[PDB]
Each structure stands twice: as structure tokens, then as C-alpha cells.
Amino acid sequence: EEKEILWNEAKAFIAACYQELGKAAEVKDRLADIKSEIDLTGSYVHTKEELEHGAKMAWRNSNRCIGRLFWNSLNVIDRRDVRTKEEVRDALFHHIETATNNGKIRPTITIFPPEEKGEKQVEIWNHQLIRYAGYESDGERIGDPASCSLTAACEELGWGERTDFDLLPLIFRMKGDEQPVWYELPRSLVIEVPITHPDIEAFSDLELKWYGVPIISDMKLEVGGIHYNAAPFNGWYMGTEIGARNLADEKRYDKLKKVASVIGIAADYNTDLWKDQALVELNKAVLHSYKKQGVSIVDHHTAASQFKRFEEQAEEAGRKLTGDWTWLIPPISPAATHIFHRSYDNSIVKPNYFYQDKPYE
Amino acid sequence: EEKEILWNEAKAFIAACYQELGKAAEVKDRLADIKSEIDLTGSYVHTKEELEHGAKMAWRNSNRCIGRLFWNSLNVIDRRDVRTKEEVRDALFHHIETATNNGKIRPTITIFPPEEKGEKQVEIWNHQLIRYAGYESDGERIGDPASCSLTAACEELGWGERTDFDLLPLIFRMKGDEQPVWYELPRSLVIEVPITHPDIEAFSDLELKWYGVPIISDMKLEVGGIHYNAAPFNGWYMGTEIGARNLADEKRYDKLKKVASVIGIAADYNTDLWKDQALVELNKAVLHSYKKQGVSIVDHHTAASQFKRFEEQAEEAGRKLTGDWTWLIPPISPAATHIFHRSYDNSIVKPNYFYQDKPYE
Numbered sequence A, B: 001e002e003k004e005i006l007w008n009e010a011k012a013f014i015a016a017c018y019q020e021l022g023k024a025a026e027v028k029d030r031l032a033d034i035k036s037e038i039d040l041t042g043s044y045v046h047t048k049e050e051l052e053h054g055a056k057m058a059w060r061n062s063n064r065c066i067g068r069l070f071w072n073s074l075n076v077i078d079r080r081d082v083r084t085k086e087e088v089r090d091a092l093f094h095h096i097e098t099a100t101n102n103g104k105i106r107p108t109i110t111i112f113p114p115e116e117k118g119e120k121q122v123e124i125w126n127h128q129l130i131r132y133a134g135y136e137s138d139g140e141r142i143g144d145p146a147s148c149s150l151t152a153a154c155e156e157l158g159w160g161e162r163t164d165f166d167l168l169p170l171i172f173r174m175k176g177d178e179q180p181v182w183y184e185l186p187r188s189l190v191i192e193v194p195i196t197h198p199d200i201e202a203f204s205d206l207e208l209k210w211y212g213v214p215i216i217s218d219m220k221l222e223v224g225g226i227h228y229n230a231a232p233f234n235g236w237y238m239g240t241e242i243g244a245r246n247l248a249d250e251k252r253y254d255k256l257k258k259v260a261s262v263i264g265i266a267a268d269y270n271t272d273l274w275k276d277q278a279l280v281e282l283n284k285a286v287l288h289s290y291k292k293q294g295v296s297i298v299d300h301h302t303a304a305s306q307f308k309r310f311e312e313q314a315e316e317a318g319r320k321l322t323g324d325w326t327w328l329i330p331p332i333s334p335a336a337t338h339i340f341h342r343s344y345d346n347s348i349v350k351p352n353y354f355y356q357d358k359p360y361e
């Protein structure tokens, strides 16, 4: 019953993958071997080639991702050999270092052992490997509200300085342990960017910063029926993620009214469009700051131009394009991108990245 | 067969409408009379009360409309008595005048005789009663590209000065005529707003203007199975419709690069976010200009605040809310509105406004 869905997903996956790799004649012998292994063992093991291409396919199929032009240059690190907390921690440290690449960010995924039969071998608690803590004590709000529950979980395990930019530790659980372990990130590994504005010297009075590399670490990678629940991956930021959402949302750092004040405009009348102007200057400052520091970043116009090339590459390859319009349009000037003016089929195609339940409340 | 769908839509409509009007006990006798009329005549005639409430319900159900808070104050003008071109033309003139209301815009719909049995009694060719012509001759682009086909149709019928802001004439066809007639709009009836900026005196060098009142005139109003294909209606503008779309879209007036130049910023690098900054200043100028001239207009923040009140009024009345997220979010700073951060059921509920085929190519 379980075995059965696995074998089907493996047929679809191996056929499609070997076809794209030009290995179509190797398909029957490989599915023979796979059908054996599933009967014998209940599961099967991807080749390095299948695992690498499967992770790239999963990015290519990620309907909500505007950055998919570059799906085929994904740097796949195969860490299915890890067995200990120390090895997990070091592989996550290595990912940060090699993905950061001194600021010239490399899109990277590190793939840990897949779930055996429902049972996770490694369970990562971080939403991103690098993220700020958040606190909420008697109406005192500090740091990143989106991190409050994970921050509270971490402080149950004996771990913050209660700045607005505390780095959460790595926190993950190994199969067999009842509690996750945590490890403080070495600060030598974490690039952060202070936010300054190209024109407005006072912008630095806000003392904003953000980290260089978004490394999403709580999504499941599914390839041919194998469930890689621990497979953190990163791209580089699109500047609106930082300037229009992380620093701007009322339920995040909520900085627009402070932005308005340091750029010298009143924040009193809706019709002054002060939120919109503050958003533009904050997003300009973010792109400027990342560029000045030599940390990779893309603006939403260039990103959508790249995504149009991805759409054209799909059609030219004879692949259906799928996409989630509500996530593809940027939160800043969306009608200034081609995305806004077309529609997308939101069908789910596998391999893909998927949400999974949090282990903390 | 035809009669049959009509009777069903009438049952659903009359029950729901009389219930909201507190006339639930009058329902059986009215559907009796309706069942008679449909058998006798093939159709039935709304009371002024049903027609007024049905048009209000249709606005309330308009999934894409952020302005629905005010659905119950819609000013319904019953023009089912018109029979001649002159009466149609005068009713459309009257609509412009009374909806404009010297700039204090009144949401108004004028309802013409419904389609008999598929056959339109009046067929309005305008997309809006007030709109600018568009021209496209040997790569010379003038006026509003969205009006090119209707403008070309109008010039087949003997009607432009080829400014960028020529008013199209009213153009409509009466049952029985093979060709529509057209009538030049009296300029005394058309308020236009020159676009100036509150801070940047050079903005007036762009010589932009827009008209005061958007009067959508090509949608079908359906109420209880009766198809009012000619029922032009208006609200007031939300400023982004003008500043983020009509004047900004590359396939409309395409003014952002000229905006950038008069506000003194370079239009060279995506990462300067010059399109976003130009959009904000253009949208500020639009709101400022309408306000200075005393013409009603709403900014997208106030509008979304109003729409949140509509959502709360729906829940408090025990009505399901429907909505189209992709049209409800504004094209400027959408994540700064509550709409962006929630989802909406896009189910179609009647009475409603619907697209219908254009009569011109």
C-alpha cells in the first residue's frame, strides 16, 4: 500500500529525469533495480545524479518562485551520509559558508537523509538557518515577531540578548532523541548588511540591518516518492522581501513610520501616499546597501525580467509553465512587471518543495 | 426551456430580495404573479423596488470591486421607458450630469430596457461614457491605445482631432437599426482634471489630464434572470486606476519615463527603483489634483480601509463575502493593505455585473 505509491512516483520521476538527462535507454534497467529495492527494502536510494537533478527539477516546479531562471545551476550538496548531531551541525555550517561565498551568493541545497518510512532522520526546527529572534513580554516587542514561537521554544532548551537582531541558534532533532539540540552560529559565518540610503544620510539613524543569505530550512523536498524533509536551500534575496515585507510589515519590524520620519515626509494623511514613498525609499536603501557591501541581491524589475526569460525557456523546451500569480507578483509596483499582466497555471508538478508541520507549537 | 431558467433565477432573486427588504410575506403572491407573466409573456418585469435593490445587490456581489462598502447608497435611475435614440442619448447625458454632481460624484446606474429574448433593445458601444480616443497610424501613437478599436469604429461612422485627449462620442445602436448612432459629448458636461504635483512645479510640463468620472457602460447587469445589457454605472476613481494604470501602463499612456525626468531622477538602472518612485509621485499628483479641483477620488489605503469595513459589515449581516484577491489588491504597495494578507472566495453570486461581447471588432 505504501510501497505502491512509492513505485508509481519513482516511475514518473525516473522516466522524466533520465529523459532530460539524455539517459532514456537506461530507464528500464534502473526501474527494474528500483522495483527490486522497494520490494526488498520498502524504499530505494537515488543516485547522486538523480538527487541533483531532482532537486533542480523541484526548484523549476516551484510555482511561487520568481527566481527559477537559474534552476539548473543549483549547487546540490549530498549529505545523506550524516548520522550524528555534530555532522548535521557542521553540514549546516558548511552550507552557510559555501552558499554565502564571501557575498557572491551561490544557490545551494544541502540534502540530509530522507524520511525512512514516515520517520524523520533529522528534523530541522529553524525556518531559515539564519534568522533573528523575536520577543513579546508584557507588550514589549523586540526583534522579529515571526520568530516568537521558535525563540520561545529555544529558550526552553537553555538558550537571547534581546536586541532586535539576535541570531537564533541552529536547532534540530535527531531520530531517537526526545529533544532537539541547539548550536550558536559562529558570527564569522554570518554576513549582515547595515541599511543605509544612497542619498539620505539620516537613514542610518534607524540602525536597520538584515542578514545576507535567506536559507529556507523547513520545507520538504520530494523527489520520486522519497521525502527529504531536511534539505535546506538558499537563493539570494529579492530586495522587496526585505524592504517591503521583513522591515515594513506591521507584524514584522514595522519600520515605515520611522522611515517616513527620517526621509523627511509627514506620516499623517493617507492621500500623501507616505507609506508608498517610505516603501520605495526603504527598498532603494536595501538594494543600495547590499550592493555597496558586495552581497548578492536582485531588484524586482530585474527578477521579473529574468522570470520572463524562464517562461520563454520553458516554452522553447516544450515544458508546461506553472506558477502562482499571487506570489510571483512583487509587493512593490506589481503592475510594472509583465507577471501582473498575465495568468499562470497553479498546478502542482513534482519533484517539488512542500510545507510540513512545525515540530514546535 | 428558456422560460425555465428564468423562473428559477426569479425564485432565488425574489426570495432573497424581499427577505432583505423585510417583505418576505409578499413573496408567494409576487412569484405567483411572476409565474403567470412568464407563462403568458415569456418574461417578467421588475418593480422599481426590485430593480433598485437588484442593482445594489449586484454591486455588493462584484468580487473585483474594492469600493463595495457603499453598495446600498447606489443611485438607481430607471430608464426602462426609453424607446428612441434621442431618449437614450439624453438619459446618458443626464447620467453624466447627475453622477458628476459638480465634482461631488454620486454612484449612479441608469438602467435601460433589458434584452427581450436575446435581442438587445439598446446596445452601448462605449466602454465608458467618457473616455479618450486612441490612434495608431504608421507607428505614430496618439491618445489612449485601449480606445484604438472603438476609435476606428467611430471613424467608420463619420466621426477625432488627434490630440492625446479627444473625447470619444457616445455611440450606441437601437434594436432595428443596422448601424449605431454617435453623439458628441457636450463639453460643459465633462469635468477633466489637469494633473499637477503638490511639490514639484515642473510636473505640469507633462500636460497630463484625466476625466473626472469613470462611467462603465459595457457590462451586463443581471437581476433575477433579466439581462440588462445596457446599464451604465459609475463610482468615483481610486487614484491608482489613473496613476498606476491609465497613465503608467506601457500599453496605455506610458508616462513613467517622462515622470522620472520631471521629478529629477535618472531612469537608467532597475536598482534605482525609478519606476517605483515615479509611480508614487504620479499617484500623489493624481490625488492632489482631484482634491484641489473638488472632484471625488479615493486613495488605495482609504479604499482598503473602507473595504475592511465592508468585510465586517458582511459578517455582521451573516452574508458570505466573495472577492477576487487579484483585483482587490491595489497595484501600488499592495502588501500595505489588509487585503493582500488574506484570501477571498471568488464564487460568483447573482445579481451581478458581467462582461459581454463587444459589438465592434
Ligand code: HEM
Binding pocket: A055, A059, A062, A064, A065, A066, A067, A068, A070, A074, A107, A108, A109, A219, A233, A234, A235, A236, A237, A238, A241, A298, A303, A327, A353
Ligand atoms: C536564486 C535566487 C532566488 C530568488 C531571487 C528567489 C525569489 C523568491 C521569492 C521572492 C519568493 C517568494 C517568497 C515571498 O513572497 O516571501 C520565492 C519563493 C520560493 N522560492 Fe525562490 N528564489 C530564489 C532561489 C530559490 C531556490 C534556490 C529555491 C530552491 C532550490 C527556491 C524555491 C522557492 C520556493 C519553494 C518558494 C516558495 C516558498 C513558499 O511557498 O513559502 N528559490 N522565491
Ligand code: HEM
Binding pocket: B055, B059, B062, B064, B065, B066, B067, B068, B070, B074, B107, B108, B109, B219, B233, B234, B235, B236, B237, B238, B241, B298, B303, B327, B353
Ligand atoms: C464608489 C466608488 C467605487 C470605487 C472607488 C470602486 C473601485 C473599483 C476598482 C479599483 C475596480 C478595479 C478595476 C481595475 O482594477 O481597473 C473596481 C471593479 C469593479 N467595480 Fe467598483 N468601485 C466603485 C463603485 C462601483 C459601482 C458603483 C459599481 C456598480 C454599481 C461597481 C462595480 C464594479 C465592478 C463590476 C467591477 C469589476 C469590473 C471588471 O470585472 O472588469 N463599482 N471597482
Ligand SMILES: Nc1ccc2ccc(COc3cccc(CNCCc4ccccn4)c3)cc2n1
Binding pocket: A067, A214, A216, A234, A235, A236, A237, A238, A241, A245, A326, A327, B340, B341
Ligand atoms: N529570495 C528567496 C529565495 C528562496 C526563497 C524560498 C522560500 C521563501 C519562502 O518565503 C515565505 C514563506 C512564508 C511566508 C512568506 C511571507 N510572504 C508571503 C507572500 C505572500 C504572497 C501573497 C499572499 C500572501 N503572502 C514568505 C522565500 C525565498 N526567497
Ligand SMILES: Nc1ccc2ccc(COc3cccc(CNCCc4ccccn4)c3)cc2n1
Binding pocket: A340, A341, B067, B214, B216, B234, B235, B236, B237, B238, B241, B245, B326, B327
Ligand atoms: N473606480 C471604479 C469604479 C467602478 C469600476 C467598475 C469597473 C471597472 C473595470 O475596470 C477595468 C476593466 C477592464 C480592464 C481593467 C484593467 N485593470 C485590470 C485589473 C487587473 C487585475 C489583475 C490582473 C489583471 N488586471 C480595468 C473599473 C471601475 N473603477
Ligand SMILES: [Cl-]
Binding pocket: A214, A241, A246
Ligand atoms: Cl526572509
Ligand SMILES: [Cl-]
Binding pocket: B214, B241, B246
Ligand atoms: Cl479607467
